[PDB]
Amino acid sequence: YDRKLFAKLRKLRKSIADESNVPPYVVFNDATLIEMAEQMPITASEMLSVNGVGMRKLERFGKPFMALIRAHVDGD
Amino acid sequence: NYDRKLFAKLRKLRKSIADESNVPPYVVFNDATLIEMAEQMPITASEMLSVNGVGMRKLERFGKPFMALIRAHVDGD
Amino acid sequence: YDRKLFAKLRKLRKSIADESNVPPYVVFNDATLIEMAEQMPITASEMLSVNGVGMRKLERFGKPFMALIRAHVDGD
C-alpha cells in the first residue's frame, strides 16, 4: 500500500469535485481510491478492474487519475 | 464495543453506493450489519459471510469496496 | 501523450498557482494539461481548441504555456 499516493488521489478527487461543484464521493468513493492506491492502475484495463470504476467514470475522470498514478510510480 | 471512526466511514461508503444505485441505504447493508462490521472488522469473504445480513449475493455485489475500506482502516492506511 | 511535457506543464502550472495563491486546478485542471500534452497546441487557435481553455484564460495564462510547449517541441 502507498499512503503518499492515496493522499495524492484524495487531492485530485477534491480538485475535480470542487471544480465540478459536486460532493467528492460523486467522483469516486474512498474504497475506489484505496484500491487505486493498492493496485496502482496505469492502463485503461487495469483501471476497469478497480471497483467503482465503470466505463462512464473512466471516460469522465480516468485520464487525470491514470496520469497521477503513472507520474507517482515513475518518480515524477 | 465498536470502532466509531470505522462505523462512520462505513456509513459514508454505504451512502455513496446506495445513492449511486438509487436504493435505500439498508438495501446495501442495514445499520446493525455495519455496526457488526465495525465490531468484527471482516477482511475476507469468509469473515464477511459470518456477519448477519451478509449472504453471498450482497458479498458479490457490495463486498469488495467494504472489505477494502475495513482492510485499510485496520492497517491505518 | 508526452510524459516529459506533461511534467513541464505541471511545473509551470504550480509556479503560476503558487504566485497567485490558488490551487493548481484553478489555473488549468489536470485533464486540460493532459490534452495539451496530447495535442501540443502552439497557436492561439490550437490552444482554444483544448477543453477548458477560453479566451479569458488565454489572455491571462496563455503565452507562458504556448512558449513552454513550443520550446519543448523544438528542443530549446
Show the cell assigned to A57. Answer: 467514470
Task: Give the distance from residue A51's alpha carbon to the nearest chain B alpha carbon, in angstroms.
Answer: 7
Distance of alpha carbon C2 from alpha carbon A71, whole angstroms: 12
Among candidate residues C61, C76, A72, A25, the one with its CA nearest the CA of residue B9: A25
In total, chain B counts a number of residues equal to: 77
Chain B residues whose C-beta sits inside 8 Å of any chain A C-beta: 9, 12-13, 15-17, 19, 64-66, 68-69, 71-72, 75, 77
Interface of C with A (CB under 8 A): 1, 3, 6-7, 10, 23-25, 29-31, 34
| B64 contacts B31 by C-beta, under 8 angstroms | no
Identify the CA nearest to A69 among candidates C12, C22, C6: C6
Widest CA span in chain C: 32
Q: Which residue reads 460532493 in cell numbers?
A: A23
Q: Grid coordinates representing B54? A: 451478509
Q: Could you tell me which residues come within 8 angstroms of residue C30 by beta carbon, excluding any fewer than 6 positions away? A: A12, A15, A16, A63, A64, A67, A68
Domains of chain A: 1-76 (1.10.150.80)
Rounded to whole angstroms, the Cα distance separating A60 from C35 reads 13
Mark yes or no for CB contact A70/C3 under 8 Å.
yes
Residue A76: closest CA among chain C residues belongs to which residue? C7
Method: X-ray
d(CA B70, CA B62) in angstroms, rounded, equals 13
- Name the neighbours of C, counting chains with at least 3 Cβ pairs within 8 A: A
A and B touch per CB criterion (3+ pairs under 8 A): yes
Enumerate the residues of chain C whose CB falls inside 8 A of the CB of residue A15. 23-25, 29-30
* Interchain contact, B68 vs A38, CB within 8 Å: yes
Of A64, A68, A30, whose CA–CA distance to A50 is shortest?
A30
Q: What Å distances lie between residue C20 and A5, B15, C27, CA to CA?
A: 26, 37, 9
Q: Which three cell numbers stand for residue A37?
A: 492506491
Question: Closest residue of A to B71, CA-based?
Answer: A34
End-to-end CA gap in chain A? 19
Question: How many CB atoms sit inside 10 A of residue A15's CB?
Answer: 19
Q: What's the grid cell of residue B47?
A: 469473515
Looking up cell 486546478, which residue turns up?
C25
Q: Helices (DSSP H) in C1-76: which residue ranges? A: 3-20, 30-39, 44-48, 55-57, 63-74
- Reference B73, options B47, B49, B41, B50; nearest CA is B41
Short-list C76, C73, C67, C54, CA closest to C16: C67
Neighbours of A72 (CB within 10 A): 17
CB contacts < 8 A, A to B, total 39
CB distance A63–C29 less than 8 Å?
no
Length of chain C: 76
